[PDB]
Design a protein around this nucleic acid. Sequence first.
RNA 1: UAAAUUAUGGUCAAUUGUUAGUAUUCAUAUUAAUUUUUUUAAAUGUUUUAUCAUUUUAUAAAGGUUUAUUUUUGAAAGAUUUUUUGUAUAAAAUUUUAGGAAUAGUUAAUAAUAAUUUAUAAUUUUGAUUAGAUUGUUUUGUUAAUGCUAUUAGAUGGGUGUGGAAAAAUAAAAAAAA
Lengths: 59, 90, 89, 207, 256, 213, 251, 180, 226
Amino acid sequence: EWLYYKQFKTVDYSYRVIPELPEKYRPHQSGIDQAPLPDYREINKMPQWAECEERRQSK
Amino acid sequence: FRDVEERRHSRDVVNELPNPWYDYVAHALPFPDRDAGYPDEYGDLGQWRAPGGPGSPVRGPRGYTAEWRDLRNPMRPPEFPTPWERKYRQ
Amino acid sequence: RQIRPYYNLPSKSEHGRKMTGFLTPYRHWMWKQNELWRNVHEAQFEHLRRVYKRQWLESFRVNADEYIYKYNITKAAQLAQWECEMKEQ
Amino acid sequence: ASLRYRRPYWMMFLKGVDNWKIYTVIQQPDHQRTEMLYQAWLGGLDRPYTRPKCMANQPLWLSKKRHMLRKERLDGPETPLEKYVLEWHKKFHSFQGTERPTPDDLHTALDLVERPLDLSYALQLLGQCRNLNNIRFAKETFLVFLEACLRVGRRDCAEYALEHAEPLGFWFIDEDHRRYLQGEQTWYKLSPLDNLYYPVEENAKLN
Amino acid sequence: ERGLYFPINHRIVDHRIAPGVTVEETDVQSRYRRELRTNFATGETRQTIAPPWSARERPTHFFSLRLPSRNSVTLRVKEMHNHLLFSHQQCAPMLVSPTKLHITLGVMTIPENSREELVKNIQQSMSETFACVQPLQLRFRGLGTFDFGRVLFIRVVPEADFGRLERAVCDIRRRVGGVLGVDLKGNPHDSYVPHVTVAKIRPNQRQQLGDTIPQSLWADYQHHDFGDVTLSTVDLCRMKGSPDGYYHTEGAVHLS
Amino acid sequence: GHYQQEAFEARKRFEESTTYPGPIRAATPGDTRFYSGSLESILHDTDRHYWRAVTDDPRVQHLIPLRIRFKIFTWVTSGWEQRMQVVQIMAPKDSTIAQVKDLVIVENQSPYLCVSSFHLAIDGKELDPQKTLGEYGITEQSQIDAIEQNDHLLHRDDERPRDWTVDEITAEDVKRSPYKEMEMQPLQNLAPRYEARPKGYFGRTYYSGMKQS
Amino acid sequence: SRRFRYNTKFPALVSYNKLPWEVVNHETPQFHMHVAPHYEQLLTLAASSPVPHIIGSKHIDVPREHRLRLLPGMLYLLDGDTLPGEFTINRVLDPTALQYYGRLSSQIVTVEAVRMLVPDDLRLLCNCITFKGPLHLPVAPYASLASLRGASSNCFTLYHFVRPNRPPKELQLEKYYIHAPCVAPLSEFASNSDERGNWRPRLQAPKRTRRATPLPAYRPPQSYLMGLAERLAVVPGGCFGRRSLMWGHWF
Amino acid sequence: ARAVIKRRSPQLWGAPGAPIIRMRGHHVVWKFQSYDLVVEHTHKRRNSDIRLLHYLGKHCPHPQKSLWSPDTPVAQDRHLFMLTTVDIDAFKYWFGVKRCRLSMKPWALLAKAGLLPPSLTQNSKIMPKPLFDKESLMRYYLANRKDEDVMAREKYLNYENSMVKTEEERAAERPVAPYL
Amino acid sequence: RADPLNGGSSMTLGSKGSKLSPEPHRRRMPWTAAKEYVPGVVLNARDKMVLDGVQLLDIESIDRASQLDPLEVLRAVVATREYNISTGKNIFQLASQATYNGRGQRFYRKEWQEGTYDKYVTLSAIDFDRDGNKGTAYGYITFHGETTTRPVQVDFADVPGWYMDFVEERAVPFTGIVPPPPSIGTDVPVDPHSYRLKAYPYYDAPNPPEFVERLLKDRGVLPDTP
RNA sequence: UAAAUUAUGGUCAAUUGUUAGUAUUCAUAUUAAUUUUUUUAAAUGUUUUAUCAUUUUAUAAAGGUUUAUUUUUGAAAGAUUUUUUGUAUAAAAUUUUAGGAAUAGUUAAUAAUAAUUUAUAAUUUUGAUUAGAUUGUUUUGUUAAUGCUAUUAGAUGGGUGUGGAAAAAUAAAAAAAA
Ligand SMILES: [Mg+2]
Ligand SMILES: [Mg+2]
Ligand SMILES: [Mg+2]
Ligand SMILES: [Mg+2]
Ligand SMILES: [Mg+2]
Ligand SMILES: [Mg+2]
């Protein structure tokens, strides 16, 4: 228990969870750009099992 | 527990004997009953003064009164002829 | 403190305390027993509380009204003394 | 051990929120333009924006607008089923939805299967109707599901639904539907109109 | 920022509201310094108050010091009328004509049956009371209100021969109300407040005029000084307004 | 309760006394504005800031301190709360309910109360603007509510103001009304900073007279 | 905790820490939550002893003018089903609302229907509850409800007028908690009853040769428990009772 | 309710809490050390005088030979002595009327004096703590229970008023002839 | 204050209790009211090892390349179901299976039926939010054959500790209204053969012998040898 | 404007320098101190709880203040089926520098007013305000003695204002709900 709480800067060792405040706390200031837009046609290509089951559907 | 205890307590004779500590509160008042040895209006210590004197709280105050009758002339022989020693009455 | 034994209900959590106070029925029964015993103690204890309370109240009655006796006599005396000093005045 | 005296009163009973100390210092100018940049990074707005005074969470309307501006996947719907699944996510997964699906909507959803891909889709819908949404089925539900697993020529899933029907929550399976999967009755159902046995290959004995 | 953080005049607890209410249930808001605004500011004056049975009946006759001709008072009250009427002419019915100005020393109800016995007896007692009193020089400055701002009058300052008035009045008070039982609207063991009534709102008037004389009229004349007057003449008057053009006078006494 | 009728009856018997001389105002003191303590306490008019052992003659009360209740929407950080604000006048004994409305309108110092027309009512029944307090038996103790125009629309989402927690506040309404005054966008000293009560204060169910769990 | 004396701390105008004023919304189930347990008590009263304005012969009629200074708070019972004029009709079919009328429908007259009626101008309300069949209470002859055909044609209605969005005070139900005895159990011994001779007294307790059957042996509970409910100040069930008596909680 | 708790000397409830009777003395060499019985609040400040309700007494924890009394061939009296000064009017006031708390060590003391029964913490580790079962206790209770009125009157005399008036002092206090 | 433990007796701080009164000790914090709570941590805590070797998808992964064999989907659904019952069953998981959403049935939590504790809840009505497994549940509490007058929100309806027993007699259609079950002292004449009272206000249970053995073998009365 | 006695009462005031014509508290004395010496302090992990939360745990950091610092019970004590009360924030005294001049969000009335309400305003030579020094009204030393000469330490503004009360960011030696 106490080891777990120890990682927190609680001044009195009070069993409370107090986080820290990093200089960069948010993605944009950490250099990270906008989440990359998904190519839609590439993820809409039918999977392998679906193609195999189409092959045994025509059989 | 209370009952067994009351029983063996009332059974012993050394009890039924008043215990000054257990029984009462001698004085409940925050101030003392009589003056003990505290400095006076002049600042003098308890040892330097005896209470009851001029610093103490005041005591306050046609025909004849009832104090007229009890009095009697030394010339007349008194009530019960108590054998006073002459030297003492002198 | 409230004693937390090892056979209390273990809480599996990494975000908080490792052991929740929840009792095996045995622990509950036990606790009840111990606490009965201390009840036995505190019965007599508070009994003595209120006993001393009435003791103190009664002594206060008696001594305080003895005080009022003596005191009233005193202030009656002073007041007599004053109205006399004013007749003289 | 409560955070009562560590953080501003309005933050009481605050949970799940990431690094709450942030929202303590947001008044300060640099933290505030940091947040302008962050909201711009999240996008969905015309203007430079910042969340209101003491709010730790984002506004309901704002996150709703974030949710509705988020482009769904499957831009290519071909089968009627895929159309209906997109409509299904529209209606029943809408942000803070009051409404909940009906067994009839699941029957409807399950009747549009053609290819095995659509079986996977309809089946995940069914998965959400049991586990996520908690919806009791009807008798004809297993009928539907069964004929659906027949349409695609995969009968594995049907008997896998039989051997344990309690987790999937089919509370009634007519005994003949069991037999058809266990192999006892060549046919699962007879179409009254057809007066023939289903499926047709078993009906080859009926001819 | 320009004063105390909590101005001292704004610290107010209302004890006529139940305890605990203001802490939890609701807060009570009021402009509290209209009520706390004092008897000097409002211009109220506490007259001897009538017992209910006496309060029921109209007063009939009153004692008055008659103002002589050529007064400082009458003149300045005329000046005040001029000013008031130039400001607001809605005052016109409220105002008392300068002809009727008199000092009111007390008010009384005489029943109509015993009328002559009472007027003769009163007149006599009055003449005996005022036998020794020489004329009275009194000072008038300041305005005040009776009956909830319906009656507007000129105060008689206790800076002068006023003292004598107070004994004098309190004697007739103990004769007229003490000896022969007569209805003085107050207690005979209490002294009346002498005044010169300037504006008044009667019951009939009250509908068109309003329930109280707005303080905006007389605010500026509130402390105005009307001057000194010596008074030799005491009257007992019945109130009839058409007999001589002055209050009808049932009795008179000369101070000399 | 018992007090009210005890003192009413006492007054009423006092008025029927054939013989009474009347009180002596040298024996009937007023009240003091000067007493120990920092706070200025307003009391009953039968009561004094000193100790008066003797019971004074019952007087009719010419200024009746009416209390009139309103509903306000108080902004707390979590969202809006509907709570109660009393306005207290001193209304002359014989006054008309129209005049009571007028006195009430002048006495309120809060910008959020009197915006539209309001009707006085007692236990939900409207009062005639025409008649006297005498007729309706209005006393200090009597409970008087006040009902605005839009108040019967408050069960909707329109008339009830919109909290920036769940609702868009736009450049349309940033320049108008309590929203404008409030300054939604946080400043360094945090603007007018309103009282806040958290979301889990009453639990999952809000405040009630009846215990719901 | 006791309520503190006065607020000198914060400006009055701003009002600061104030318990919210509870207001009853008629659109939600919560409305009925408040109103229902009153109705039952009310009907109970009507079953024992008379109360004056409870029973009207016909629908009350008032002008538009005097509408809101007469109606609000009014509660009266009628024989038939007729819905007040100029009132939009809302059926209450939502189950959560219907739910609170459970006790009233089981142990008093069965509830046939519930209706929320709102005036066209929208500022007035009428809660209309239609009961079916005879009371499951006994009805006194001199009692109010004895003047009604719907009790003792078997349907009859309760009508309650109220303003919307008001505190659950000024719907006036609390005047009705006057309590009169049901004389049904003693009706047996009155000189009017002919079954009073079929009565026989037990003056003396009968000789008993057997003790009460002993309770089944106690099984100590097997799961984890939250600790002494005594020390946690939990009343015996988390239900009712005093924390000093711990009866019926586990051990 | 302190943001950063004072970690070393915690208590229960807000300070100043209910008054508690404590033993305290400055620390020194064991040869000279004395203690003070003190009624004070629950939360102490740097100097113990700031919250101090009353001063109950000095207690010296050093067994002493009694040189004040003459050397006495009596066996028991020549055991060493332990000296303590109790103020018992203040004690009975504070404890009884004001309802104090008690730390354990002062409790042991006042137990020795006969003001209190021995404490909860004084353990002969010879005996165990007792067992209990309700049916046996019930048999013992049905066996012995006194009358209701006797018990009520005992509670009356112990808790409420003790000093009562016999018929005699009534008869002696009621007025005689000229006003009778 | 209103209801102390053993009256005020102050001889130890622990003598009072872990809470001084049922009622909230500060007026500004109402939720401090004494309830009967439940071990939420353990009873939520669902088993994530049940989801081992499964291949779940997400809600918004609708992609063609993303989803899987219908067989894989089925064992995924079964794994998820087993994951949700993995602790106990939530009310809303019990109620959706019963007729009429289980209106009228008696829902008892495990610990309410063991020991001298006897309590259950008759269901008055249910609101399913869009997510099952959560919601609001109202009903009547019945404690030792004594029942509530009006319905109440059932507390801890979401925590998975609940059992019930389906009876056709108790079922109510959504049209009608769930009646409160009769409190056995008042509405129904008290009968011994129909219902016997487990425990009453001054009662408490006799000592189970294994506890006694254990406590003496603890305190060192009865010996215990390694 | 008279003595006094039924006699020592009412409980201890007692000063110690060997100088250098004379005038003036001034070198070398005793007591008390600093010079002067490890026999009284002490180490870090406060604690429960219903679980990412919520209950318990309120005056030793610095800055330099002389017309200056002032307060409740709603927490706990605390007893009991539910409501119940009123008293408080204000002042008066005591206030330092060898050679001495002006100070200022400013007084009082109004009022839950007025960054422009009204007024012949307020503090000061009976010593102000700035500025130096300084921790304020039972604590010591010397002495026969009115004196002279010490006394630490601890309350340093506001800015989502929680809490009964701000006393709230190492530095105990206060047992903190079995
Ligand atoms: Mg308390
Ligand atoms: Mg400090
Ligand atoms: Mg300085
Ligand atoms: Mg001073
Ligand atoms: Mg001061
Ligand atoms: Mg700061």
